[PDB]
Amino acid sequence: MFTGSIVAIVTPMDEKGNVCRASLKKLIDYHVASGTSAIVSVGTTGESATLNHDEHADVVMMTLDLADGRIPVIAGTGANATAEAISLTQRFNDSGIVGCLTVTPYYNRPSQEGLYQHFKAIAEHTDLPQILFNVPSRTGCDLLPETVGRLAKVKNIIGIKEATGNLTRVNQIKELVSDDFVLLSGDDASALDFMQLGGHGVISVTANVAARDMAQMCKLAAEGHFAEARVINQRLMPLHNKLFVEPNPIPVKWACKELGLVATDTLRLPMTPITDSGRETVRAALKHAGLL
Amino acid sequence: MFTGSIVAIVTPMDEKGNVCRASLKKLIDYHVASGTSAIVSVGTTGESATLNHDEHADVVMMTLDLADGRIPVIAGTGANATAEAISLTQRFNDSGIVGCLTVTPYYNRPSQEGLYQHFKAIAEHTDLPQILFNVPSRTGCDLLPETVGRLAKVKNIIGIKEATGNLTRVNQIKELVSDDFVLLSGDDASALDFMQLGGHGVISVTANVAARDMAQMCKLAAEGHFAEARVINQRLMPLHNKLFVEPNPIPVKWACKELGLVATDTLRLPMTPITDSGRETVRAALKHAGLL
Amino acid sequence: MFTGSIVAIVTPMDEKGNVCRASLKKLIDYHVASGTSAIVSVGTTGESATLNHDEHADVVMMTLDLADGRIPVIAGTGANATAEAISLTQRFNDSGIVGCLTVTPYYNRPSQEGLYQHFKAIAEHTDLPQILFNVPSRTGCDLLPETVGRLAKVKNIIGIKEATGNLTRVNQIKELVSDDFVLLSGDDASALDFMQLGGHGVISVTANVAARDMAQMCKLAAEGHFAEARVINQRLMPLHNKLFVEPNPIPVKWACKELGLVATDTLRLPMTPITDSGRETVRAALKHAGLL
Amino acid sequence: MFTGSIVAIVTPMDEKGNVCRASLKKLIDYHVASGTSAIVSVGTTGESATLNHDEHADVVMMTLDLADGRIPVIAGTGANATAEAISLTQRFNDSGIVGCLTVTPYYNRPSQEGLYQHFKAIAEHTDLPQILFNVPSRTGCDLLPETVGRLAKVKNIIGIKEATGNLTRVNQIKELVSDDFVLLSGDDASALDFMQLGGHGVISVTANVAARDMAQMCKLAAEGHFAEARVINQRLMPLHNKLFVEPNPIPVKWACKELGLVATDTLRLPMTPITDSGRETVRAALKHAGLL
Known part of the structure; x- marks a missing residue:
């Protein structure tokens, strides 16, 4: 499933930074119960940057196992070298995942033609559906709509997570691609606007802690009940902003811990513990959402 | 040596995309003869992003052996995960390199506290001199002068490659660190200005193909003879700019091949072959510099 | 009328730069016949910058006179000194205009509190409805939604022309103001998106030359037929962009002349005649729109 | 004189918002005694935006008479309409001012060709020396070095006040113009760096309240004694920054009043009185500078 509220799930860790199976199970049970459409495992919010490929794979397999067929899982698979991706x-391949979320190469700043060849080659060597991921603030490059349109012609490139926060991109992409190509927001604070403009859902950080609200908001949005959805969004808006008051996933892992959904808020360097000021900002956003 | 013209050397490759030993030797001899003060091996211009760590280590060791004590070699050691760095x-460690060039974590956007804990841990696990590297347009994050001052108090952290193109940073950093701390431009087009403000040199892409002029420009600059250094800078300014007409190192590798310094201009995806129009652009800048 | 397609009308000039009554009459007749909701007289596209207040007033009175009750007229009244505004x-006052379009003070970069006091004082000393105008790219300041919300409580501040091109502003403002406060796009290329998000119309440069299409597009948008409206918008999109290939109103005045709607494309300095390259770009956009 | 520390002088006002003659005389005497090289009368810091042209002319003439041949006076003459400039x-003309400081048209965003025709026409209608003024954050447009080179060939155009804060412009402009052409910082915080790169002085806001230190800093800089000039710059750096904590000239006028240099800190709307928090911020920077 590539529609509705999709959680960019945290990789819960113990005090030594290793995946905590018991916390992860709890999160997955929570998403199944809360109506989340799918789980992105080991994307950016899941600390893909600081797990090696072995640990990365372990977490995705563990996520599949615990999910036990109850909720679809999309693996983060992005890399800035095409051969590594x-x-x-x-x-x-043949793991049980329903698809992949794959980011534009970060740091090395390839051209549009380079981005096209990067994703075409990834897509060629798998049957799995691919969701392109654009996030220039993190990567230093910007997959423009024209190039998205070229890539949409590839059979198994089926959608895009668009995280510019630039809402003009929704209809620039939409007019260049087929009606079943999926447009997903990657920016929680502008995500309802994104869907109102024609987007099909959101890959969401807020959904880690407000899964039920997020699921309902996205369904109302898909039904065209945008005013009903904005009431919920307005409740969640302090969360949409303050979950990024310190580098993601520091705030959301703290929030998960405060709610009792995970055992520890431990991250791996170069992420560092939340400051006390961040604590009180995030706690106030959780209260505004009605979660504490 | 952490002063004068330091080349951010390309990793020349055969048509298969693996390191070409004869081309690398030719390049190293060229830098020894040209007066280049040191080599950065497998930094960004050397395609650190598309080489695995074994391949990257093989290239560093091969560069060191080929240098044969004639020119100091600095290894690129950057990673966005601290344990990996x-x-x-x-x-x-104990290899013969004189120091490391280590970039701010890219993609995961650490806070200033995160950047501090990252570089500090790295420095504590080595005896090698460490040069910080800040390049916000590639990384999505910006190591501010205040934090550079903090890290400069670590015995082992001895300088910064500053690639913002924002020349105010030279004296913001200088007043916060000791006189022994080295300040190096990471932006060829503004590197002479950077030295005129008190910078000690440049880690240069232009030097790959104009090593003699670059060495002489930096020597004049260190001596305070700025007007004569500008005459060289003006010859070189089209290269400073046009070597980034397409994503680095696509232009510089083609220019190396055109000058007979390497056998092929092959790169790894997501870098792609230079376009015809970029070929003509770089040819004209080489001509302007008097090289072709 | 402060809803639908509102033309930011050109001030047609003869060869000496003086208002051309015959050309202006023709334009007004054209807007009456084409279903334009209203005319903004002597706003930015009408060269408010280069007419003095006497000429400014003359043009607005001439516009009222020629309009002859058939179409409502809104006068541009912005200034960067509160007393001048x-x-x-x-x-x-008592001229026949239905309202005023008043820009954030440009150049002097006041604070939010300054902007609040600026517009409150203007509003206090007239009965005429006021439409706030935000355009940071031109002014160097940005009237934020919070401050718009404070100003909306003033009886006769009735709306805003929002020209950031940042579509998140639509619902940030809307939730802070009453349901009859009017939200108008000031950015043609993102205007349909703006209306789809909840905006009520557009103060438009494209409407100078594609008035009928613009009127229909805005009505379809107000009725919720966004797909039907996008077909028209897609026809107009090259115009939405290329009318700004050279500084507005240089391209649109040329376009008006090519269509026969005005006698000359003359502007006042520091606007200069369209280049030949601009000519062919704009002409191609007019053809794509089906106007030539 | 178009060299050394040139003050962008405030227009001190009584509580009614009209020019206060006794405060202005006190300021001019202060600059004569302090070693200030020249006064810019009714530039931006002098509230050119909120004075009509008659009032602005009255202030220039009063400043000239009060200077009584002891210190050269440059008039601000900027306008966004060429005929008005x-x-x-x-x-x-024939008034006793030594030159004019004239800004790129603000708000109407002319092309580079427009900027050329604007300044050229101005220069042709006067015998007075003209200093160009580029400040893109206020004006919405950017006079590039290439165009500065063009205008410098006009006999009458003799320098530029460069307020981008982008220090690369110093040598981009310098190589395109003759050695007689003057280069002046328009950004206090980077002005010493600007002079170290070959700049000839600064038109300064800081100098309003620290005229002695500024004159001495610029004199040391012209002599090549940069390290001793930095010691003064560091004393002054909190002012360089905090004098823009609120929109200029709100901070500098309050600081003038606190030092007993003017009778009131009154400004015209849309500038508003300094906040309590800004009061405390500016007080601390004055203390740091040793003035209070």
Whole structure:
């Protein structure tokens, strides 16, 4: 499933930074019960940056196992070297995942033509559906709509997570691609606007802690009841902003811990513990959402 | 040596995309003869992003052996995961490299406190001199002068490659650190200005193909003879700019091949072959510089 | 009328730069026949910058006279000194205009509190409805939603022309103001998106030359037929962009001349004649729109 | 004189918002005694935006008479309409001012060709020396070095006040113009760096309240004694920054009043009184500078 509220799930860790199975199970049970459409495992919010490919794979397999068919799982598979992205993708073939979320190469700043060849080659060497992921603030490059349109012609490139926060992109992309190509927001604070403009859902950080509200908001939005959805969004808006008051996923892991959904808020360096000021900002956002 | 013209050297490759030993030797001899003060091996211009850590270590060791004590070699050791940066740094402990060039974590956007804990841990796991590297347009994050001052108090952290193109940083950093701390431009087009403000040199892309002029420009600059250094800078300014007409190192590798310095201009995806129009652009800038 | 397609009308000039009555009449007849909701007289596209207050007033009175009750007229009245904005506003009291379009002070970069006091004082000393105008790219300041919300409580501040091109502003403002406060796009290329998000119309440069299409697009948008409206918008999109290929109103005045709607494309300095390249770009956009 | 520390002088006002003659005389005496090289009368810091042209001419003439041949006076003559800039310039022909400081048209965003025709026409209607003024954050447009080179060939255009804060412009402009062409910082915080790169001085806001230190800093800089100039710059750096904590000239006028240099800190709307928090911020920076 590539529609509705999709959680960009945290990788819960113990005090030594290793995946905590008991916390992860609890989160998955929570998403099943709360009506989340799918789980992105080991994307950016899941600390893909600081797990090696072995641990990355373990977490995705553990997520599949615990999910036990009750909720679809999409694996993060992005890399800034095309050969590495292919290799990582091969690790998940015939695993049970329903798709992959794959980011524009970060740091090395390829051209549009380079981005096109990068994703075409990934797509060629798998049967798994691919969701492109654009986030220039993190990567230093910007997959423009024209190039998205070229890539949408590839059979198994089926959608895009668009995280510019630039809402003009929704209809620039939409007019260049087929009606079943999926447009997903990657920016929680502008996500309802994104859907109102024609987007089909959101890959969401807020959904980690407000899963039920997020699920209802996205369904109301898909039904065209945008005013009914804005009431919920307005409740969630302090969360949409303050979950990024310190680098993601520091705030959301703290929030998960405060709610009792995970055992510890431990991250891996270069992420560092939440400051006390961040604590009180996030706690106030959780209260505004009605979660504490 | 952490002063004068330091080349951010390309990793020349055969048509298969693997390191070409004869081309690399030719490049190193060229830098020895040209007066280049040091080599950065497998930094960004050397395609650190598309080489695995074993391949990257093989290229550093091969560059060191080929230099044969004639020119100091600095290893690129950057990673966006701290444990991974330590691990890569440790491959070079007691190897003969004189120091490491280590970038701010890219993509995961750490806070200033995160940047501090990252570089500090790295420095504590090595005896090698560490040069910080700040390049916000590639990384999505910006190591501010205040934090550079903090890290400069670590015995082992001895300078910064500053690639913002924002020349105010030279004296903001200088007043916060000791006189022994080295300040290096990471932006060829503004590097002479950077030295005129008190910078000690440049880690240069232009130097790959104009090593003699670059060495002489930096020597004049260190001596305070700025007007004569500008005459060289003006010859070189089209290269400073046009070597980024397409994503680096696509232009510089083609220019190396055109000058007979390397056998092929092959790169790894997501870098792609230079376009015809970029070919003509770089040819004209080489001509302007008097090289072709 | 402050809803639908509102033309930011050109001030047609003869060869000496003086208002051309015959061309202006033709334009007004054209807007009456084409279903334009209203005319903004002597706003930015009408060269408010280069007419003095006497000429400014003459053009607005001439526009009223020629309009002859058939179409409502809104006068541009903005100034970067509060006392000048008041004085200019007093010139139009009891003139027949239905409202004023008043820009954030440009150049002097006041604070939010300053912007609040600026517009409150203007509003206090007239009965005429006021439409706030935010356009940071031109002014160097940005009237934020919070401050719009404070100003909306003033009886006769009735709406805003929002020209950031940042579509998140629509619902940020809307939730802070009453349901009859009017939200108008000031950015043609993102205007349909703006209306789809809840905006009530557009103060438009494209409407100078594609009035009928613009009127229909805005009505379809108000009725919720967004797909039907996008077909028209897609026809107009090259115009929405290329009318700004050179500084507005240079392209649109040329376009008006090519269509025969005005006698000359003359502007006042520092606007200069369209280049030949601009000519062919704009002509191609007019053809794509089906106007030539 | 178009060299050294040139003050962008406030227009001190009584509580009614009109020019206060006793405060202005006190300021001019202060600059004569302090070693300030020249006064810019009714530039931006002098509230050119909120004074009509008659009031602005009255203040320039009063500043000239009070200077009584002891210190050269430069008139601000900027306007975004070319005919208006000419008219204002002509008020000062044969008046005793030594030159004009004239800004790129703000708000109407002319092309580079427009900027060329604007400044050229102005220069042709006067015998007075003209200093160009580029400040893109206020004006919405950017006079590039290439165009500065073009205008410098006009006999009458003799320098530029560069307020981008982008220090690369110093040598981009310098290589395109003759050695007689003057380069002046318009950004106090980067002005010493600007002079170290070959700049000839600064038109300064800081100098309003720290005229002695500024004159001495610029004198040391012209002599090449940069390290000793930095010691002064560091004393002054909190002012360089905090004098813009609220929109200029709100902070500098309050600081003038606190030092007993003017009778009131009154400004014209849309500038508003300094906040309590800004009061405390500016007080601390004055203390740091050793003035209070």
